[PDB]
Design an enzyme around this catalytic site. Structure first.
Site, mmCIF file in Angstrom:
data_model
loop_
_atom_site.group_PDB
_atom_site.id
_atom_site.type_symbol
_atom_site.label_atom_id
_atom_site.label_comp_id
_atom_site.label_asym_id
_atom_site.label_seq_id
_atom_site.Cartn_x
_atom_site.Cartn_y
_atom_site.Cartn_z
ATOM 1 N N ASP A 197 6.633 9.633 -5.993
ATOM 2 C CA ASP A 197 6.549 8.198 -5.693
ATOM 3 C C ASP A 197 5.647 7.468 -6.664
ATOM 4 O OD1 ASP A 197 7.467 5.897 -4.443
ATOM 5 O OD2 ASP A 197 6.337 6.199 -2.567
ATOM 6 N N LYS B 131 -6.793 4.785 5.871
ATOM 7 C CA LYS B 131 -5.359 4.621 6.039
ATOM 8 C C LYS B 131 -5.009 5.122 7.413
ATOM 9 C CE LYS B 131 -2.355 7.074 3.597
ATOM 10 N NZ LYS B 131 -1.512 7.469 2.424
ATOM 11 N N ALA C 97 2.105 0.287 -7.267
ATOM 12 C CA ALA C 97 1.329 0.178 -6.008
ATOM 13 C C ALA C 97 0.502 1.462 -5.801
ATOM 14 C CB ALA C 97 2.253 -0.040 -4.799
#
Ligand SMILES: CN1CCC(n2cc(Nc3nc(NC4(C)CC4)c4c(=O)n(-c5cncnc5)ccc4n3)cn2)CC1
EC number: 2.7.11.1
Length: 270
Positions: free
Chosen positions: A129, A45, A133
């Site tokens: 969160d 990432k 996803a």
């Protein structure tokens, strides 16, 4: 965790090749690239606020290790063990032509995701969160909670973060509570049952959580919304998962069940 140099990560990703099939997708705060090390496929990432989220990710991963959480391998850029089946969001939409998940796999994935959230809450961490996803799937379709950049170890904040279609009402006002993670998991359970994304601007209703009100007001039933891309769903287990989702989606945070209760309800379902 291993300390990688930027030039090593640049080389294993073909100078961060932005073309798709080294670009795998777009993560929370950056782009994810496929790489290799010693024959192991990895995910890289590539990302002041951003630096603090990088540090939080490392700190939470250092303390929290569980079968239902992703594994950080190192950093420079954050390096993880490549999850062969990508995200639950993409598998629910059959992105790139992958076959639809069976009801049986969906139940295991829901149980695994709840076990992961339970582990985080037992270790006094709020994810902030939770969404499909952020639920990755390994080689055996084991659910792995990812992205702890916003994690935090009642209480308010000025920087309201998260994904609007998954957010509890109190989270949208600035509260930070593990009860908000329960609410977001309720939206995930609805995505698992229906195969629909949490928000679709070209759909009526736009927000998936609104179907809870349609079912309660008897304008529709859970059967009208069950994903038609399954052949093995049964009304009893589907209704039991919908009951957990409905409890999680209570507008009053104190009326929602804790993650241990959600985990118990999902276990009794199978
Ligand atoms: C048809 N076939 C083609 C390949 C495909 N596929 C496999 C993958 N693996 C995959 N993807 C990821 N991210 C995306 C979902 C792509 C955006 C990540 C990821 O973000 N992290 C991560 C990032 N930050 C924090 N913690 C973890 C770790 C692992 C990971 N692994 C993607 N696509 C599966 C279907």
């Amino acid at each position: 965790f291993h300390s990688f140099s930027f030039y090593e990560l640049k080389n294993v990703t073909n100078n961060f090749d932005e073309r798709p099939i080294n670009k795998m997708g777009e993560g929370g705060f950056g782009v994810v690239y496929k790489g290799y090390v010693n024959n192991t496929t990895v995910a890289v990432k590539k990302l002041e606020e951003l630096k603090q989220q990088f540090d939080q990710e490392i700190k939470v991963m250092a303390k929290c290790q569980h079968e239902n959480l992703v594994e950080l391998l190192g950093f420079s850029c954050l390096v993880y063990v490549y999850m062969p089946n990508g995200s639950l969001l993409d598998r629910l939409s059959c992105l790139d032509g992958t076959p639809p998940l069976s009801w049986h796999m969906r139940c295991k994935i829901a149980q695994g995701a709840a076990n992961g959230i339970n582990f985080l809450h037992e270790n006094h961490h709020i994810h902030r969160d939770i969404k499909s996803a952020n639920i990755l799937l390994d080689e055996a379709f084991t659910a792995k909670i990812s992205d702890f950049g916003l994690a935090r170890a009642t209480v308010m904040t000025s920087r309201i973060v998260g994904t609007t279609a998954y957010m509890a009402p109190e989270a949208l006002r600035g509260e930070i509570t593990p009860k908000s993670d329960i609410y977001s998991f309720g939206v995930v359970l609805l995505e698992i049952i229906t195969g629909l994304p949490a928000v679709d601007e070209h759909r009526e209703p736009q927000l998936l959580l609104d179907i809870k009100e349609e079912i309660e007001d008897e304008e529709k039933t859970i059967e009208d919304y069950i994903d038609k891309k399954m052949n093995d769903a049964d009304s009893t287990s589907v209704e039991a998962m919908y009951s957990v989702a409905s409890q999680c989606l209570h507008e009053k945070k104190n009326k929602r069940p804790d993650i241990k209760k959600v985990q118990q309800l999902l276990q009794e379902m199978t």
